[PDB]
Amino acid sequence: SPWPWLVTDTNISFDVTVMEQQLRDFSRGCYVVNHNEKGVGIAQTAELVADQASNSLPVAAFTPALGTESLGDSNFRRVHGVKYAYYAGAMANGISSEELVIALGQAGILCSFGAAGLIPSRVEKAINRIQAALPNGPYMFNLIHSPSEPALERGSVELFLKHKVRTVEASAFLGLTPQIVYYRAAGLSRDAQGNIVVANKVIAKVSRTEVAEKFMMPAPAKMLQKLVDEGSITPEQMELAQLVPMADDITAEADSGGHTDNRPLVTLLPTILALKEEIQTKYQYPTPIRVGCGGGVGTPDAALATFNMGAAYIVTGSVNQACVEAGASEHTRKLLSTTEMADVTMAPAADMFEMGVKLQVVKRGTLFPMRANKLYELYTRYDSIEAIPADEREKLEKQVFRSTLDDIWAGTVAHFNERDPKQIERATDNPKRKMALIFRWYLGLSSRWSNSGETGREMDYQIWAGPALGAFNQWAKGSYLDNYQERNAVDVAKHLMYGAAYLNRVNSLTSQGVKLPTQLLRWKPTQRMA
Amino acid sequence: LSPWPWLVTDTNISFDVTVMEQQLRDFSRGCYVVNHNEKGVGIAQTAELVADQAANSNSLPVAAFTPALGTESLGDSNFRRVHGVKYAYYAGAMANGISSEELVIALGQAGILCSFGAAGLIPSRVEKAINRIQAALPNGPYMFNLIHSPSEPALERGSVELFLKHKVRTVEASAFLGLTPQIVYYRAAGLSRDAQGNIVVANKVIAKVSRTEVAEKFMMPAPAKMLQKLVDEGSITPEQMELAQLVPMADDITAEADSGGHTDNRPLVTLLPTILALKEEIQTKYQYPTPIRVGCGGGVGTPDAALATFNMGAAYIVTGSVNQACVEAGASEHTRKLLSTTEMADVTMAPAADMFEMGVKLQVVKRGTLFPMRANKLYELYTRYDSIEAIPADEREKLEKQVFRSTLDDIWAGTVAHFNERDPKQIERATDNPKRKMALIFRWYLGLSSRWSNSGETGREMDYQIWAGPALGAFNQWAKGSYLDNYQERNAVDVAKHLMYGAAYLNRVNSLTSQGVKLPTQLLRWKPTQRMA
Ligand SMILES: Cc1cc2nc3c(=O)[nH]c(=O)nc-3n(C[C@H](O)[C@H](O)[C@H](O)COP(=O)(O)O)c2cc1C
Ligand SMILES: Cc1cc2nc3c(=O)[nH]c(=O)nc-3n(C[C@H](O)[C@H](O)[C@H](O)COP(=O)(O)O)c2cc1C
Ligand SMILES: [Ca+2]
Ligand SMILES: [Ca+2]
């Protein structure tokens, strides 16, 4: 035995309730003893075998005082000014709302404002509110890649730069773009001491090794010289942009709610971590690149598994939409509280509909995925809305669109023409495009209906969620978290973090050969954390 | 206050990263970490208590400590004991002998459990496999795959009787949707009492499942009714029937997450806690003297994933994908070379030949073969149209020239001959159903693509159906730039030991990092910088 202590019999508890309370106490170490008869016992005080003296037992196992700060990368917590190696990911169209961002940031927890799909004045509005509530952070804003429209992306970056938004979650990118590189380089300088200052921080969320590679390596000299080209960056921005990675943190996004490649967390995260060590050994950054991970994290066990694999931080998404601070309707959050792991499925995505791309959504309690998948089948099979069989089309019009396809198209032409005339000119004299735009009316609005609580459209709510939500609901069954109105994002974050810490301590004891009562092997939500 | 009551003498500290790596890799000894004000993080393997043997010297206090713990600290020691193996690990079955006799024998010779891939093999071929494996491993360890035959109960029964005749004492039961009389017969026929100690379970069963119901059925004892039926056959005895109700139908349950081959794509991190919670329920109910165990595979291709799986509570880990790429596997040189460069995103889902019409899928390689594209096109056409005659002429002629290399009518004629000889009901059922006819025609391609890849059919390489999941891509990225880049140097025992010793190494490094030590970054992960076997 490596443990040089003895435990007095009066300091041991063989009571499983007392033992759980000792294991839950991260401020003190635990000493485990084996009584041939009363079984496993735990104490919090021990003496050296020579310092104090029979009726003493030798320490069979030990685990020291360690809490949530022992999980993940301390440099993440330092760089982002957060109390936990954790962030709540963006949720589109304000689902990761100002209320959610402010509630989490006030508790010291990073959260990403869901700017995707929101108009610029709405986003500036969120910037002002969040910065007024959190003058020193923490928070970040989602920059979603706009492949069709680089100007929108550039405007979002310029809004962030104007207001000194210092942290961006960059997602849906397939590589670098001038806009994100601009945001990155505009924040680079040096102090009077040679230390280089990275003021604009970037968390790049990726699921593909090549995209991760682009964000782990510095911005390419060519793109930076074309930014020195205009009125965008400085000769102090380029020299330094080539000595720092394009991102401080890489989020490996496994199988998730919403847009996803449905990649296993146990295969995606090791791949990105191996790439991280390759690139970090090559470039020898003074502050190393970090890799965190989300997608499937709904329970303390999944969180601990993610940390144990090497993640610098964990990311949650699906469980946060179910909390009262999220910008989801009352009906939607109620529905989410009973969604099981098999109650999600893949359905066509509005913004990549014609390319066959899908996203993960709730399928129980809503007909959205069935109707959206039917739209994709009709789109691919037929050359035009006029080629759709009459029965199918009148089913569409009366139950899905609640209007004729012609009237949907008329509204689409009016809307686009008076906003983005390129979209309607482009579909002019092309029935495939026309049909795709008509169907995207439904694909686009179903999300909004769920977010706003549009009455009478419940059967059509598009609700992004992955199996992490069902995992959460199963783990929380029989607790106060069964009530959707009792779900708070800060409380959820703390359950995941403190539960992972508890499981980590228990695993250390099990690893040392101790057989704990089954009442100590897991963290049940029998008490509120916040 | 620091919990470590030792100090470390200066001559026992190393700040050399190579030596520190050797120390962390040495699981027979503990590691004491110190912070030297000037030289930084250092490691020693011996420390002394502040009194005992030290005096005021150049000694430093222990900033962190981790004890001597290796691979035996991973998983369930009862798994290792019951199956007679050195590691809580097994290489899962790979159909049509891909998990070959040589693979089983290499792994079992190293003390590692492997499952012979009997699926799709005729009885004389399986008997030849039994002969070889038992000649090389007269006392084990090994097991054989019993795949559920829903269509054919007689074949499952024949495989069970072959296993019983030859005293095959361990079966991996897979693709089951519940109990069958055959698996129950295998389990109960191995039951007795030593009449002086306690009940003896000689025929061991590892049930690989993805659903809770089936898992529950194998965690619970065989149902009395099922045991009572055939008690009239003389297959088992009344003392075997009565003992069968005191033991679970399986000693081990493999929770199969998203995997190569047949899969429903369940996340490991959500499936495994579910099956473990069910296990603890059932074990609290029945209080078996030897507890039921739950292990896990599907996505385990790297040591970090192995460790995470163990730390969620898995009794053992299961690998598949990475084993097909090794030299002992019964895969062709073309396939093993292709697999050594298959990346994480080079796999995809394609229709399964069995339950094709039900939309059921399996995970396959898409780089180096057009099979998944062509098979998914077959499923799309099948679901869209009511008959082969409804397919547009240009699409049908493309199919016939590029996929079947034959008209669909000629495929149908050969199909009629084939099933007349082997299962005529399948043609009879198609008589008044053109949809069924089309499904049978498309299943020609779904079946033969597998046969072509397994046998190495020349000229059909672009149609090879090759089962693999992203665990292979994870392995390949983790092994990039190492000796494992060469497919000719990939050995299954070596892979297993990298997973097991890497998981133990990472567990130790995680403990030290959690305690606040900042180790040199080269030491934070287990990289294949060394051959293990
Ligand atoms: C309803 C919902 C909306 C989301 N919207 C966005 C988004 O707009 N931009 C983005 O980068 N990620 C978005 N995500 C992804 C999350 O930020 C997070 O990465 C992911 O949900 C974590 O996986 P999980 O769902 O299994 O928890 C969204 C997720 C959900 C559930
Ligand atoms: C090519 C291949 C063939 C397989 N054949 C079988 C089989 O015949 N029977 C079975 O039970 N499992 C079979 N499996 C599943 C493996 O035994 C194992 O459960 C699975 O591969 C583990 O998941 P992984 O691929 O992510 O490692 C096969 C897997 C592969 C890759
Ligand atoms: Ca997403
Ligand atoms: Ca399988």
mmCIF file of C-alpha atoms in Angstrom, chain B residues 243-356:
data_model
loop_
_atom_site.group_PDB
_atom_site.id
_atom_site.type_symbol
_atom_site.label_atom_id
_atom_site.label_comp_id
_atom_site.label_asym_id
_atom_site.label_seq_id
_atom_site.Cartn_x
_atom_site.Cartn_y
_atom_site.Cartn_z
ATOM 1 C CA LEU B 243 -30.137 -24.111 -12.622
ATOM 2 C CA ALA B 244 -30.800 -21.985 -15.716
ATOM 3 C CA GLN B 245 -33.252 -19.862 -13.719
ATOM 4 C CA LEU B 246 -30.560 -18.920 -11.177
ATOM 5 C CA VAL B 247 -28.047 -17.449 -13.648
ATOM 6 C CA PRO B 248 -28.350 -14.672 -16.253
ATOM 7 C CA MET B 249 -28.635 -15.675 -19.887
ATOM 8 C CA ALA B 250 -25.316 -13.889 -20.496
ATOM 9 C CA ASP B 251 -22.258 -13.276 -18.339
ATOM 10 C CA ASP B 252 -21.378 -10.116 -20.265
ATOM 11 C CA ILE B 253 -23.417 -7.569 -22.226
ATOM 12 C CA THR B 254 -21.597 -5.633 -24.941
ATOM 13 C CA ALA B 255 -23.269 -2.255 -25.455
ATOM 14 C CA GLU B 256 -22.607 -1.718 -29.163
ATOM 15 C CA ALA B 257 -22.525 1.972 -30.060
ATOM 16 C CA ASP B 258 -22.030 3.451 -33.547
ATOM 17 C CA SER B 259 -19.829 0.885 -35.294
ATOM 18 C CA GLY B 260 -18.512 -0.383 -38.574
ATOM 19 C CA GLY B 261 -20.885 -2.752 -40.281
ATOM 20 C CA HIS B 262 -24.390 -3.214 -38.908
ATOM 21 C CA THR B 263 -25.320 -0.280 -36.675
ATOM 22 C CA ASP B 264 -28.140 2.018 -35.571
ATOM 23 C CA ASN B 265 -25.555 4.776 -34.832
ATOM 24 C CA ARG B 266 -26.212 5.242 -31.118
ATOM 25 C CA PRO B 267 -23.805 7.623 -29.313
ATOM 26 C CA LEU B 268 -21.455 5.734 -27.000
ATOM 27 C CA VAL B 269 -21.652 8.468 -24.339
ATOM 28 C CA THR B 270 -25.436 8.099 -24.108
ATOM 29 C CA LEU B 271 -25.886 4.377 -24.817
ATOM 30 C CA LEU B 272 -23.350 3.112 -22.268
ATOM 31 C CA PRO B 273 -24.836 4.864 -19.165
ATOM 32 C CA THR B 274 -28.276 3.582 -20.206
ATOM 33 C CA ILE B 275 -27.188 -0.070 -20.382
ATOM 34 C CA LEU B 276 -25.166 0.330 -17.166
ATOM 35 C CA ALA B 277 -28.204 1.715 -15.297
ATOM 36 C CA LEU B 278 -30.235 -1.254 -16.555
ATOM 37 C CA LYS B 279 -27.448 -3.589 -15.389
ATOM 38 C CA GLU B 280 -27.449 -2.155 -11.871
ATOM 39 C CA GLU B 281 -31.247 -2.427 -11.705
ATOM 40 C CA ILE B 282 -31.208 -6.094 -12.720
ATOM 41 C CA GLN B 283 -28.250 -6.966 -10.481
ATOM 42 C CA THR B 284 -29.889 -5.319 -7.465
ATOM 43 C CA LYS B 285 -33.003 -7.364 -8.244
ATOM 44 C CA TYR B 286 -31.441 -10.812 -8.725
ATOM 45 C CA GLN B 287 -28.249 -10.424 -6.646
ATOM 46 C CA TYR B 288 -26.343 -12.941 -8.762
ATOM 47 C CA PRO B 289 -23.301 -14.192 -6.791
ATOM 48 C CA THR B 290 -21.151 -13.354 -9.818
ATOM 49 C CA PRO B 291 -22.542 -10.001 -11.039
ATOM 50 C CA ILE B 292 -23.610 -9.366 -14.608
ATOM 51 C CA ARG B 293 -21.122 -7.156 -16.434
ATOM 52 C CA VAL B 294 -21.541 -4.599 -19.223
ATOM 53 C CA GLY B 295 -18.731 -3.765 -21.631
ATOM 54 C CA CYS B 296 -18.742 -1.540 -24.654
ATOM 55 C CA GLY B 297 -17.560 -1.134 -28.225
ATOM 56 C CA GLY B 298 -18.294 1.031 -31.223
ATOM 57 C CA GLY B 299 -16.023 3.992 -31.855
ATOM 58 C CA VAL B 300 -13.037 2.680 -29.848
ATOM 59 C CA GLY B 301 -10.025 3.093 -32.102
ATOM 60 C CA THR B 302 -7.660 5.119 -29.912
ATOM 61 C CA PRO B 303 -6.405 4.935 -26.320
ATOM 62 C CA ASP B 304 -8.174 8.127 -25.208
ATOM 63 C CA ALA B 305 -11.538 6.714 -26.307
ATOM 64 C CA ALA B 306 -10.635 3.406 -24.632
ATOM 65 C CA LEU B 307 -9.929 5.170 -21.337
ATOM 66 C CA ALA B 308 -13.100 7.274 -21.523
ATOM 67 C CA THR B 309 -15.128 4.121 -22.166
ATOM 68 C CA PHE B 310 -13.571 2.331 -19.186
ATOM 69 C CA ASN B 311 -14.125 5.371 -16.948
ATOM 70 C CA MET B 312 -17.834 5.518 -17.818
ATOM 71 C CA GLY B 313 -18.077 2.095 -16.171
ATOM 72 C CA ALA B 314 -17.432 -0.375 -18.992
ATOM 73 C CA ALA B 315 -16.261 -3.779 -17.764
ATOM 74 C CA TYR B 316 -14.228 -4.205 -20.981
ATOM 75 C CA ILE B 317 -13.762 -2.487 -24.331
ATOM 76 C CA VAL B 318 -14.523 -3.978 -27.756
ATOM 77 C CA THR B 319 -12.662 -3.149 -30.970
ATOM 78 C CA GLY B 320 -13.657 -4.059 -34.517
ATOM 79 C CA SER B 321 -12.808 -1.521 -37.250
ATOM 80 C CA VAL B 322 -9.108 -1.248 -36.346
ATOM 81 C CA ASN B 323 -8.700 -5.042 -36.418
ATOM 82 C CA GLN B 324 -9.733 -5.510 -40.059
ATOM 83 C CA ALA B 325 -6.719 -3.359 -41.001
ATOM 84 C CA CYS B 326 -4.164 -5.697 -39.327
ATOM 85 C CA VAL B 327 -2.133 -8.405 -41.040
ATOM 86 C CA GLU B 328 -3.736 -11.266 -39.089
ATOM 87 C CA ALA B 329 -7.219 -10.323 -40.294
ATOM 88 C CA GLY B 330 -8.698 -12.277 -43.171
ATOM 89 C CA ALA B 331 -8.974 -9.224 -45.405
ATOM 90 C CA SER B 332 -7.267 -8.918 -48.751
ATOM 91 C CA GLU B 333 -4.073 -6.971 -49.299
ATOM 92 C CA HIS B 334 -6.105 -4.476 -51.343
ATOM 93 C CA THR B 335 -8.546 -3.983 -48.475
ATOM 94 C CA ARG B 336 -5.932 -3.700 -45.718
ATOM 95 C CA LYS B 337 -3.909 -1.188 -47.731
ATOM 96 C CA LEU B 338 -7.079 0.814 -48.434
ATOM 97 C CA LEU B 339 -8.017 0.704 -44.736
ATOM 98 C CA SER B 340 -4.641 2.015 -43.566
ATOM 99 C CA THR B 341 -5.419 5.407 -45.163
ATOM 100 C CA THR B 342 -9.177 5.524 -44.527
ATOM 101 C CA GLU B 343 -9.820 8.740 -42.620
ATOM 102 C CA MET B 344 -12.517 9.741 -40.102
ATOM 103 C CA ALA B 345 -14.821 11.176 -42.799
ATOM 104 C CA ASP B 346 -14.176 8.429 -45.365
ATOM 105 C CA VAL B 347 -17.089 6.277 -44.108
ATOM 106 C CA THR B 348 -20.833 6.593 -44.626
ATOM 107 C CA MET B 349 -24.138 4.741 -44.261
ATOM 108 C CA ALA B 350 -25.460 2.420 -46.980
ATOM 109 C CA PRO B 351 -28.395 0.010 -47.287
ATOM 110 C CA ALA B 352 -28.039 -3.396 -45.641
ATOM 111 C CA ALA B 353 -28.871 -6.432 -47.789
ATOM 112 C CA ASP B 354 -30.919 -7.855 -44.907
ATOM 113 C CA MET B 355 -33.894 -5.617 -44.103
ATOM 114 C CA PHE B 356 -33.053 -3.530 -47.176
#
